[PDB]
Amino acid sequence: MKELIYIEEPKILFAHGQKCTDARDGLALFGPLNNLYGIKSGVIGTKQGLKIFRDYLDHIQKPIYNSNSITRPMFPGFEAVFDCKWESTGITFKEVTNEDIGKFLYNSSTHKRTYDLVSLFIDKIISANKNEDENVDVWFVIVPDEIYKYCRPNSVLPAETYNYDAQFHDQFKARLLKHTIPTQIFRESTLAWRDFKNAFGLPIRDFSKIEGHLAWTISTAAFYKAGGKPWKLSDVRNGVCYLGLVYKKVEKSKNPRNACCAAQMFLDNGDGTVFKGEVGPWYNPKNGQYHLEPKEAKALLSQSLQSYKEQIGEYPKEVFIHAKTRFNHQEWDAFLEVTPKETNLVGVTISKTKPLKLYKTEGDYTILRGNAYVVNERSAFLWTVGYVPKIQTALSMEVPNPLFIEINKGEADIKQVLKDILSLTKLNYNACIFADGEPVTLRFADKIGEILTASTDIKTPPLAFKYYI
RNA sequence: UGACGGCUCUAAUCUAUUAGU
DNA sequence: CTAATAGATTAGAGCCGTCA
Numbered sequence: 019m020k021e022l023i024y025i026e027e028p029k030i031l032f033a034h035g036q037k038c039t040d041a042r043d044g045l046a047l048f049g050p051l052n053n054l055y056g057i058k059s060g061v062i063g064t065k066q067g068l069k070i071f072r073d074y075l076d077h078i079q080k081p082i083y084n085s086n087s088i089t090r091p092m093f094p095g096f097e098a099v100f101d102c103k104w105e106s107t108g109i110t111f112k113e114v115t116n117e118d119i120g121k122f123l124y125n126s127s128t129h130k131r132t133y134d135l136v137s138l139f140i141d142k143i144i145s146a147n148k149n150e151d152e153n154v155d156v157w158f159v160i161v162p163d164e165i166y167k168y169c170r171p172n173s174v175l176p177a178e179t180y181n182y183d184a185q186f187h188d189q190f191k192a193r194l195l196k197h198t199i200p201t202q203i204f205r206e207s208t209l210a211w212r213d214f215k216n217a218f219g220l221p222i223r224d225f226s227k228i229e230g231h232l233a234w235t236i237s238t239a240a241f242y243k244a245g246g247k248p249w250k251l252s253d254v255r256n257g258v259c260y261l262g263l264v265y266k267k268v269e270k271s272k273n274p275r276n277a278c279c280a281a282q283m284f285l286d287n288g289d290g291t292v293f294k295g296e297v298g299p300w301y302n303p304k305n306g307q308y309h310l311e312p313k314e315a316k317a318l319l320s321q322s323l324q325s326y327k328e329q330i331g332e333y334p335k336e337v338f339i340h341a342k343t344r345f346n347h348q349e350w351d352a353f354l355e356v357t358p359k360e361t362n363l364v365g366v367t368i369s370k371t372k373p374l375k376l377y378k379t380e381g382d383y384t385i386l387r388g389n390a391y392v393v394n395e396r397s398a399f400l401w402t403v404g405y406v407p408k409i410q411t412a413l414s415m416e417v418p419n420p421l422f423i424e425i426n427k428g429e430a431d432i433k434q435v436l437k438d439i440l441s442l443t444k445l446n447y448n449a450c451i452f453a454d455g456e457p458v459t460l461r462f463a464d465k466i467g468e469i470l471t472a473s474t475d476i477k478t479p480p481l482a483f484k485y486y487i
Numbered sequence: 488u489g490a491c492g493g494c495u496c497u498a499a500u501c502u503a504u505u506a507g508u
Numbered sequence: 509c510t511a512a513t514a515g516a517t518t519a520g521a522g523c524c525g526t527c528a
């Protein structure tokens with residue numbers, strides 16, 4: 019017989035200085051942190067896409083209701099929540115004719131057709147940003163569904179074009195990094211989900227009972243990409259810098275090699291949260307070696323410490339390096355010789371590989387979300403997915419898998435590590451959910467690494483997330 | 488790519504030992 | 509260097525479900 023400890027919910031902060039565990043209820047009752055005046059939208063696409071986008075904007079102005087209110091809270095309309103204006107009147111439209119899309123998607127080569135389509139879509143945006151006077155906050159791209167199915171890694175149709183990955187989204191986001199334009203990509207079937215059907219008279223994707231969830235998610239993404247702040251973490255310890263490292267293989271560049279990208283989070287003076295990336299891949303020619311050479315790791319730590327010191331004035335007292343791999347002595351000894359003496363380096367490995375499952379005896383639901391099984395002083399299991407009493411349901415299906423936390427380097431208290439990891443799961447601005455399954459320091463550093471490796475080398479890429487997600 | 492979760496098919500790398508070079 | 513047996517790790521792709 020073993021013992022399980024339970025970890026309390028972290029709580030997040032909204033307007034008026036109010037707290038709550040659910041983002042939706044906090045946004046509905048108190049509203050966002052900062053105050054935008056309005057969002058001016060630029061749309062690029064066909065006439066069908068423009069009509070669909072205008073219809074969705076008109077649709078999401080009124081209150082929207084879900085089938086089960088307890089599980090998913092209602093959507094009370096955009097302006098009731100966000101206290102700003104985003105209507106179908108600040109739209110500036112740049113038409114893309116259907117002939118171009120038809121004729122470019124004919125070469126039968128994925129690389130050439132993807133490059134041509136991306137260039138066609140981005141040249142108009144570049145021109146409208148350079149040679150025009152109108153102001154656009156977030157650009158909205160509305161791609162037809164018939165090009166989405168063909169621009170994928172493994173896709174077959176039923177000149178510096180080979181240096182890029184054959185995916186529309188990654189290349190599109192990468193090639194606009196040097197102009198710093200926020201963008202949101204939509205599929206025609208995502209907004210006009212009724213009109214696209216199958217052999218039966220039903221939509222392929224049925225949003226009849228989860229329409230409020232889609233409205234919440236789209237509104238939150240559009241409000242974040244316009245330079246807004248919808249919530250923040252209530253309790254973050256001072257003097258603690260959280261880092262996150264992810265390795266992505268740079269496919270098809272003269273050899274099989276792989277890079278590394280990071281993310282960082284801390285609390286700055288003024289009770290603000292600085293959640294921002296750490297960019298510029300650090301490589302190593304070895305194939306399958308998910309590690310860093312000393313020269314490439316000293317630079318990474320120096321960069322992170324310099325950033326924190328520049329924003330704060332003093333070095334961090336504690337630095338936690340979360341990762342999904344295991345460090346070695348060769349690279350960890352590269353650490354600790356650029357780190358000062360008044361700073362604690364803790365390297366924590368997070369994985370979801372070990373197959374443990376817990377079942378309730380004489381019941382029908384799953385285990386709580388706070389439960390943790392402490393194996394040792396350097397090892398534990400934490401359930402980040404499970405039954406949440408507030409929404410009266412679980413965050414997954416079947417029986418969820420635990421997250422295996424293992425203190426790899428340094429010394430730390432495993433309970434505090436679990437508390438910080440659980441608190442790091444409430445900052446998913448790409449989503450409007452109760453909580454996420456893994457820390458976002460490992461997810462946003464993965465999105466940035468996925469975008470950065472689908473283009474040629476670009477000097478000093480932006481750090482802000484709004485240009486990536 | 489509006490999110491998230493759960494599965495499946497695949498490919499490397501390392502360590503140990505053996506063997507033709 | 510090449511070719512097999514294992515254990516213990518890693519990163520990629522692709523498909524399905526979300527309510528009652």
Ligand SMILES: [Mg+2]
Nearest residue numbers: 202239448487
């Ligand atoms: Mg997004």
